[PDB]
């Protein structure tokens, strides 16, 4: 089984949408078109020495196509997302990732360009760069599995999916000023591999806005 998903002028090859977590059980919904497509970010290399990676949302897509154009040329907007993490590796690599979606992921070691990496995303550290096992804020990472999450354990699966509804104190809000979601991908178990295998496996993120809607155009 190999599903070939499509959104407009974009196509993605998912092994299967078997493990697809919906954050807090709520599917994205409008308030009771073209921007909502697959935007695949620049891959990051997971090595033995990695501590983690993190992107914000909608900050990650501030430059991507219409979801960037609209996100600037409007004032207010809301959007759910579909973060698809593909971590294609061999059968002779081993490790685990924890993909955690975090509402209002306020990081701490704080000045807009600092907490808004954009497309490339930031990285954690193990002692700016926030701490890996803390997620910046003093917070034991074990308890981090409260958040909407999924485990990419290479021995069994090599891709996760996260459907994220719009989560904010407001019905609609300015996307330029204020992020809603924060994706953090941290290695629960370290990478390891056979003798001379590819020593750094790639992690790819495919973000797809869902129920993207904005007001008011200038």
């Amino acid at each position: 089984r190999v599903l070939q998903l499509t959104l407009g002028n974009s196509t993605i090859t998912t092994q299967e949408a078997a493990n697809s977590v919906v954050a807090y059980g709520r599917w994205p919904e409008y308030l009771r078109v073209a921007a909502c497509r697959f935007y695949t970010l620049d891959t990051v290399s997971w090595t033995k020495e990695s501590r983690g990676w993190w992107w914000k949302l909608p900050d990650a897509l501030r430059d991507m196509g219409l979801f960037g154009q609209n996100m600037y040329y409007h004032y207010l907007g809301r959007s759910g997302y579909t973060v698809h993490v593909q971590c294609n590796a061999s059968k002779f690599h081993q490790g685990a990732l924890g993909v955690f979606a975090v509402p209002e992921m306020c990081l701490a070691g704080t000045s807009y360009q600092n907490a808004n990496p954009g497309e490339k995303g930031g990285t954690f550290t193990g002692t700016f760069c926030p701490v890996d096992y803390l997620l910046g804020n003093g917070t034991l990472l074990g308890n981090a599995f409260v958040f909407p999450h999924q485990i990419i354990n290479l021995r069994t699966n090599n891709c996760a999916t996260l459907v994220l509804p719009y989560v904010n104190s407001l019905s609609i809000d300015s996307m330029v000023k204020h992020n809603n979601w924060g994706i953090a991908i941290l290695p629960l178990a370290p990478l390891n591999f056979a003798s001379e295998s590819s020593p750094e496996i790639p992690i790819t993120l495919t973000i797809a806005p869902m129920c993207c809607e904005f007001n008011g155009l200038r």
């Binding site: 002028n9 974009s10 196509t11 993605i12 090859t13 092994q15 697959f38 935007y39 695949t40 991507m64 196509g65 593909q86 294609n88 495919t206």
Partner: peptide, 8 residues
């Protein structure tokens, strides 16, 4: 950003 296919 344009038309494409992510071939696996």
């Amino acid at each position: 950003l344009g038309t494409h296919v992510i071939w696996d």
